[PDB]
Symmetry: C3
């Protein structure tokens, strides 16, 4: 009755679970002691000059790394705000999560249209948000005096959502003293010890035994000395939980989905923040965040290209989700409540994309015979010409109302008439439906 | 003056020590905290349906593994007898060995005809029966408050017997949470950690330094990550104790004897219990155990085929040896006191085996020129025809009395006349002696 | 801005730092708890019968190893002086360094002409002379209650000298119980554990972070399991401290200089004691030590052949340097104050060596155009014929005074007249200077 064996050839048998492929949209949570200072220079996105990136790091979870660079703006801010005698470690005692309600979060992610949730159980600073027995630097012994991963796991599952775990396998600044100043530094500033490979193995195993997560989401690769451990760990995981899944940031020959942070025959997932960082950043306002309209557009783009969206939320150290983020999540969810059928459970079509003469981008998703045509915007006119597309027969109709639409092939293109009556009832995106 | 070097080519120089080849018969002791419950379903022997084996495990030392399977009869028995809130670990506090006398055991094994003794210093549950400094889960800090391995080592040696050690290198359930339900589970449900490879190395070394055992008997393979350590450990062992020996369950290119648990040019050893399990089992009665006659027959069969017999004894948690087991050991010893010369110090002949027309099995052993003919039973008649055997000359005579016997070759066969007078003085086995 | 990458091909880019090549002469310090007994049989030098070497070990730092051999003279001396119930470990409590002044040492090494200093931070007995967090068996928690490595680092640097560290990577008798009796024993009597490879990595790293030494001087190889760690550790070291250096006793493809303990195109270094041992030995008198004259002769010989001299000092457990050693260091320094220009900052010539008809050895060093001719002794005569050497033109003159000397080529040889007036002002060595 155990199906999976501990070797890569055997672990290939485990394909991406249907629930994940159908889920389309999940929530990432970067929440730690780094949330307490919750500070970073909001420079930009990947592809900002990577030479200065670590010196002007827009990722607020990297606070400790930035704090270790004395030249950095983070060091100035830390000394000015907390003093030079305040070690990063001490944020664990200020990290109280006093106003945290896990069910409010789970409900928020549900209403946002999210189908799975993945919190940082341990990020690069090595602080663990569960009562792990392999370090005392955890949320049960320090600040919150509470198993944050567990109580969130109960909340997300009770809300009917899948629960995955993020674990920083590659980096752990409890095991190094120097900061990362350039990308090349990452090739040698790592724990490197056999001890650490055991520590990571033991910890992810502990996560598996305690919470049996639906996703194992690893960050920054797996320690070279422990890479062979993963075939034992995957087999173990899958045999306990066949519908479990695993990302592609381990550095070994197996993964269930690829990740991207900037039509394919494999399942993948785009991850990004609502803002510029993953962890809470005070300095971010609306100018640094995507709008409800842009989130929708992104989500539709990714789904049409075969991917999920893993949108990150960065809560404050008190356990509340900033109104700027909550606002955008509820907006996305309001579009999903309305157009979900065109997203959830869909498949890629023969092409991802097309455009009008007016310049409006178009994205396609499939649901057996039903082909959704999702416009990235609402054309201000009845006559709509789609460039380079033909339809041989059948019935094209307006998705939201169900009203039949007149259409015909004009050479390479396809003309469709959509009455203003119908275009005016749509929100953010005109959606059509063919057969 | 150090002969052995730490590489497999060099360690091949160490052949099986003469004492072991000459010893023929040794005692295994499976004794732990698992002895306290001392319970298992007495299903059968290896080759019972291996699909159900772990679910209906007849090995009482596997109690914890069986306890971890909630479906199992062991789980029912544990809850009913000790409660669900009684963790396996707590048997260490009930394991008092209150009536243990190590010299009574040593004397018992001596009278049984045993030439060496091998107790479980640490089995799969990871409880160590010596004051090891690498774990507190040992017999010095817990229940017995006593170095059981050491005090037994003194007793066995004072009785004039060789003392080996059993160590579970392959399995240690202090390092895993899941049970073994199928054989395939063993390929991934292991400690797996570098930590554990160090732990096993350090522990066997500690055994070597403290007790310098005559046999290193490993169980369930050696951790893959520590396999290279063994060439250092063997060289070390042999250089301290050249007459030391090592079994073949390490998974590396060197061994002094092979083990079997169901005419060869290498030394080997058959191991089995007096009953169906190795550890004490309450549920076993005489119907589940070999008789004195069967033990003799086994011992003779194995010795004629070049092997030793490692017969297992399973003591109670109070440190007493059940009368059913003691009875059979004393019976074997009574046959050995009588026919020892035909077993101890012997060698394989040109063939192991033969049979009479009446169907009685025959086994041969050699002692230079003296060829022992051991019948598996006592024929009820003077005229005895051995199928397919000839003797060219010399003098065949009755072993116990020394009386010359008349014989001749009849075609393929050999006829021997053994007067009822002599057949009636033998016990269990007619033994003859040729030249 | 990080130049070095963690692979051997990339680490070859780091050549020996100029300061080291120019330094020529450094001081080794073997100082530990072994200094307290400070005892060894002064047998001889390497190339003494190596069969008896460990049994009659002249290296006083090996006391514990010798103590573990019950046959040895060290065992007799220990029992007689301290009792059989006095474990080697307890010397850590007698090792008080009560009269230690680090600035007196630094000043002593400065006046001796030494340009760098390398103390044993941890030798084979595993006692660390700094407040390491990876073992309590250190100088901060035990005897001296003081960071000896650190306070010496401050003293040497304030005196203007470079400070390196010696670390015993290969051997650590905190991790083994058996002694080394023969050289072959070293191939298996080692820590061997993954644990230990981590321990050594972590400890040298800690040295790098705390003191950023100018030399990493490893002893007895690097643990096989940790050898790959060194490319990460070297890159790390070099990127923090490009002028750092590394010796060749790691057993990996990279080193900055070779070591010797008995004309090459690579930089190397001869290491030896003033006496026969490295650690303090009571039993050594002047008969076992080199004279000021011999030290000079050695230093000149090594420098002419492209090497540095790493002369060892062995202090008492009270932190004082024996007068026999201090005397010889001050003597060497008095010659260096006088002839330094001919040694410091020099380069190898087209040949190392030559000789007179009278049998006096000669050594050459180069300083651009200035070619120093250093006689190993002072000829008692004006006419000096150097065998097999010609000079085409230029001006040969007496180094100390600057007085021009008459000379000519006579066949293969070169005759030089040096007035008694000038030969009588030299000390230990006649030095000439050509162009
Ligand atoms: C989700 C995100 O992952 C990591 O970010 C990394 C980028 O995604 C990218 O792979 C580059 C190469 O490295 C980035 N690391 N940084 N900064 C985490 O580091 C990050 O904290 C966050 O968890
Ligand atoms: C002596 C005996 O050894 C192990 O038993 C194993 C069998 O001998 C056989 O090798 C199969 C493949 O695995 C058995 N394990 N089980 N159950 C120990 O497991 C057993 O406890 C005992 O020590
Ligand atoms: C400096 C010196 O190094 C080691 O001595 C070793 C010799 O230099 C040589 O390499 C031989 C092969 O092994 C010697 N070891 N011994 N004895 C150290 O062992 C010694 O203590 C000292 O540090």
């Amino acid at each position: 009755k155990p199906r999976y064996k501990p070797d890569w050839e055997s672990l290939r048998e485990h394909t991406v679970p249907k629930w994940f492929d159908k889920a389309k949209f999940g929530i990432f949570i970067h929440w730690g002691i780094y949330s307490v200072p919750g500070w970073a220079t909001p420079t930009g996105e990947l592809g900002v000059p990577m030479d200065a990136w670590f010196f002007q790091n827009p990722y607020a979870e990297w606070y400790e790394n930035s704090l270790r660079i004395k030249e950095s703006p983070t060091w100035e801010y830390h000394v000015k705000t907390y003093g030079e005698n305040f070690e990063y470690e001490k944020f664990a005692d200020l990290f109280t999560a006093e106003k945290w309600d896990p069910q409010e979060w789970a409900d928020l992610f549900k209403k946002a249209g999210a189908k799975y949730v993945i919190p940082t159980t341990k990020h690069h600073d090595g602080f663990c948000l569960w009562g792990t027995k392999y370090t005392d630097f955890n949320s049960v012994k320090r600040g919150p005096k509470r198993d944050l991963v567990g109580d969130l796991a109960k909340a997300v599952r009770e809300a009917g959502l899948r629960f995955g775990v993020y674990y920083s396998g590659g980096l752990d600044w409890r095991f190094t003293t120097e900061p990362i100043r350039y990308p090349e530094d990452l090739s040698y500033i790592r724990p490197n010890t056999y001890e650490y490979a055991d520590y990571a193995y033991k910890q992810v195993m502990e996560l598996v035994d305690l919470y049996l997560p639906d996703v194992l989401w690893n960050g920054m690769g797996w320690p070279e000395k422990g890479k062979e451990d993963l075939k034992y760990l995957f087999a173990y995981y899958y045999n306990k939980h066949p519908e479990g899944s695993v990302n592609d940031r381990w550095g070994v020959p197996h993964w269930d989905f690829k990740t991207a942070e900037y039509l394919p025959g494999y399942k993948w997932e785009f991850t990004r923040g609502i803002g510029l960082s993953f962890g809470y950043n005070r300095n971010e306002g609306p100018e640094h965040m995507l709008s409800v309209e842009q989130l929708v557009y992104t989500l539709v783009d990714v789904v049409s290209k075969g991917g999920n969206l893993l949108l990150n939320v960065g809560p404050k150290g008190d356990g509340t989700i900033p109104d700027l983020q909550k606002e955008r999540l509820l907006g996305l969810g309001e579009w999903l409540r309305k157009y979900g059928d065109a997203i959830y459970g869909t498949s890629v079509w023969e092409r991802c994309c097309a455009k009008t003469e007016d310049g409006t981008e178009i994205r396609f998703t499939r649901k057996c015979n039903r082909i959704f045509v999702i416009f990235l915007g609402i054309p201000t006119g009845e006559k709509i010409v789609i460039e380079d597309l033909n339809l041989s027969a059948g019935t094209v109709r307006h998705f939201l109302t169900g009203e039949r639409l007149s259409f015909k092939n004009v050479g390479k293109n396809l003309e469709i008439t959509v009455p203003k009556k119908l275009l005016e009832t749509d929100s953010i995106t005109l959606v059509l439906e063919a057969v």
